[PDB]
Amino acid sequence: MNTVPFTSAPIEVTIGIDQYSFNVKENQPFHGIKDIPIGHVHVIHFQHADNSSMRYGYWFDCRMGNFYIQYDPKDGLYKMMEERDGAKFENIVHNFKERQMMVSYPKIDEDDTWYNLTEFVQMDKIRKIVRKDENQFSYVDSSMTTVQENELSDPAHSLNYTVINFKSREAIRPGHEMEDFLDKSYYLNTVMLQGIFKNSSNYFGELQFAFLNAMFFGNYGSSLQWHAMIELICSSATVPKHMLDKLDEILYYQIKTLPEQYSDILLNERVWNICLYSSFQKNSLHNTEKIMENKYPELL
Amino acid sequence: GAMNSSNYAELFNNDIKLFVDDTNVYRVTVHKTFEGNVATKAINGCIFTLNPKTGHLFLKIIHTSVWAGQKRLSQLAKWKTAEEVSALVRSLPKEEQPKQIIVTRKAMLDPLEVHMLDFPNIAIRPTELRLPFSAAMSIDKLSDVVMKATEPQMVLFNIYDDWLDRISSYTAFSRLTLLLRALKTNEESAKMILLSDPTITIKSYHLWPSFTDEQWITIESQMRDLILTEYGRKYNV
Numbered sequence: 001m002n003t004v005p006f007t008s009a010p011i012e013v014t015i016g017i018d019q020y021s022f023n024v025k026e027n028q029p030f031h032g033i034k035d036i037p038i039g040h041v042h043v044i045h046f047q048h049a050d051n052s053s054m055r056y057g058y059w060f061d062c063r064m065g066n067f068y069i070q071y072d073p074k075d076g077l078y079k080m081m082e083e084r085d086g087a088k089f090e091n092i093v094h095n096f097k098e099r100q101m102m103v104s105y106p107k108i109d110e111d112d113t114w115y116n117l118t119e120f121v122q123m124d125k126i127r128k129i130v131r132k133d134e135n136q137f138s139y140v141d142s143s144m145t146t147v148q149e150n151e152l153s154d155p156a157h158s159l160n161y162t163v164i165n166f167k168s169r170e171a172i173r174p175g176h177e178m179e180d181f182l183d184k185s186y187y188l189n190t191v192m193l194q195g196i197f198k199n200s201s202n203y204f205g206e207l208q209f210a211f212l213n214a215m216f217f218g219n220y221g222s223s224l225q226w227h228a229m230i231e232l233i234c235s236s237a238t239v240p241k242h243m244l245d246k247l248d249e250i251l252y253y254q255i256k257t258l259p260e261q262y263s264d265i266l267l268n269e270r271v272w273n274i275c276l277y278s279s280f281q282k283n284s285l286h287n288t289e290k291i292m293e294n295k296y297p298e299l300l
Numbered sequence: 301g302a303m304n305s306s307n308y309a310e311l312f313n314n315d316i317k318l319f320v321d322d323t324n325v326y327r328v329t330v331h332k333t334f335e336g337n338v339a340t341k342a343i344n345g346c347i348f349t350l351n352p353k354t355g356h357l358f359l360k361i362i363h364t365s366v367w368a369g370q371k372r373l374s375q376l377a378k379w380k381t382a383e384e385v386s387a388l389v390r391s392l393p394k395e396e397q398p399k400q401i402i403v404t405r406k407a408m409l410d411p412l413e414v415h416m417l418d419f420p421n422i423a424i425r426p427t428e429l430r431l432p433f434s435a436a437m438s439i440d441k442l443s444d445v446v447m448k449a450t451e452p453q454m455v456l457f458n459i460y461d462d463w464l465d466r467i468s469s470y471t472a473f474s475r476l477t478l479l480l481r482a483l484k485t486n487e488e489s490a491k492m493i494l495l496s497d498p499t500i501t502i503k504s505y506h507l508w509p510s511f512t513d514e515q516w517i518t519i520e521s522q523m524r525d526l527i528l529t530e531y532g533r534k535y536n537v
């Protein structure tokens with residue numbers, strides 16, 4: 001189990017750690033989060049009490065370094081930093097645990113939710129989407145736009161998701177215009193899976209990461225990316241059986257976890273109705289269709 | 301965006317543009333089979349591609365052999381239209397290629413956009429107008445060449461005859477739409493109006509009779525009449 005200590009909490013803030021969250025009052029004696037499960041990526045995120053505008057946060061993996069949070073009063077936000085002095089870090093964490101000034105990552109033992117949401121998400125791939133090479137962790141916020149959004153404006157602060165565009169020369173082979181537009185298998189299997197992602201695990205990892213950025217930061221370009229990657233699979237007549245079964249599990253846990261009050265803005269009626277009821281894969285997503293119909297029958 | 305009443309004048313500016321109408325591409329007769337079921341028999345169709353400024357009509361005849369062994373023909377017909385329009389653009393010199401293609405049905409937008417990805421600078425646009433180009437097959441010489449075709453074939457027509465010698469492209473396209481609206485509302489009456497006087501003939505190289513200016517105003521009024529009439533007969537007014 002690993003720890004992310006905080007130097008202090010000078011401003012009132014709601015702090016999230018993965019799917020959990022808790023309120024910290026201005027100058028409350030809070031010094032971080034302990035017992036974080038090893039083996040998964042994690043995200044620690046913030047919403048200031050004064051300005052609920054801008055949710056922001058950091059993706060990280062405790063196996064890649066000792067990380068801590070420190071408020072910056074010039075830039076006005078909680079910043080993740082790496083501590084290179086290992087002895088200094090262990091000494092700090094040990095003292096904070098002794099004084100019991102840390103919250104415990106509150107995982108229930110039955111609960112595989114976080115694993116199920118991050119199964120294919122790797123920190124190495126996160127850092128290729130979020131380019132900031134001098135850090136081992138990655139910053140995301142509500143306002144960051146994607147590379148495809150910038151084509152339709154600061155390149156350094158963008159989300160470099162894989163561009164998917166159904167009406168593009170990449171998606172459409174000359175002389176197969178109708179075939180490739182109505183059945184996207186070529187684009188899924190040859191262009192994207194064989195050509196760009198190399199395997200389905202990397203594809204699912206990007207999909208899972210796009211969902212999580214949409215849910216935790218309200219990042220619109222991330223929501224667009226999540227829906228596009230779902231639609232590309234659902235609009236392909238030829239998809240490996242293992243990929244469909246895994247997609248059903250992935251989406252099931254995403255829909256299960258999504259906040260009920262956010263479904264109106266985070267779920268695209270057209271994509272979901274197409275995928276569940278009109279697409280080639282309309283009969284292949286049993287778990288997802290069942291939870292969607294019982295939880296969001298309005299959307300459909 | 302979409303073409304509507306508010307921007308009707310754009311059609312007659314000097315940017316090359318084409319209307320594409322696919323209504324008559326996939327045509328069938330419905331009939332009973334010996335067992336008393338229903339079946340369709342396709343007949344020849346055509347794509348109607350028209351430059352509204354010049355009157356140039358590129359009439360691509362769709363021979364029934366293109367449907368042989370194919371499924372979902374109404375959907376295929378939209379993609380076949382898009383393929384043929386794309387091939388026509390590619391066959392024209394660059395300075396003759398359109399800057400805009402306006403489709404008369406919104407269902408052509410995606411098929412045409414996809415077939416024209418190579419031409420990112422050609423704008424594909426819908427229209428809010430209810431243009432009467434489906435009645436093109438009520439023009440006898442056009443229907444005759446479509447029905448006689450035994451193979452795919454492109455046939456070139458000036459749909460305005462020689463009118464642009466005497467009138468503007470806005471008055472010509474306005475007249476063409478009036479004649480086609482009439483033919484669509486009551487074909488027999490419209491054709492009666494156009495042909496009643498045997499002394500006004502259709503030249504071998506024309507589609508419509510050789511009316512004087514004065515006779516065209518009479519004709520247009522009579523077509524202005526018919527369309528209100530059949531509107532009363534239909535609606536009881």
Ligand SMILES: O=C1CC[C@]2(c3ccccc3)NCCCN12
Pocket residue numbers: 356357358456457458
């Ligand atoms: O007016 C014209 C110009 C040449 C043309 C033509 C060319 C392209 C499209 C329609 C018409 N060919 C014969 C028909 C009349 N002709």
Ligand SMILES: O=C1CC[C@]2(c3ccccc3)NCCCN12
Pocket residue numbers: 471474475477478520524
């Ligand atoms: O029958 C009529 C009356 C209106 C119209 C017209 C004008 C623009 C569009 C269509 C029809 N005026 C001039 C053309 C003949 N017309």
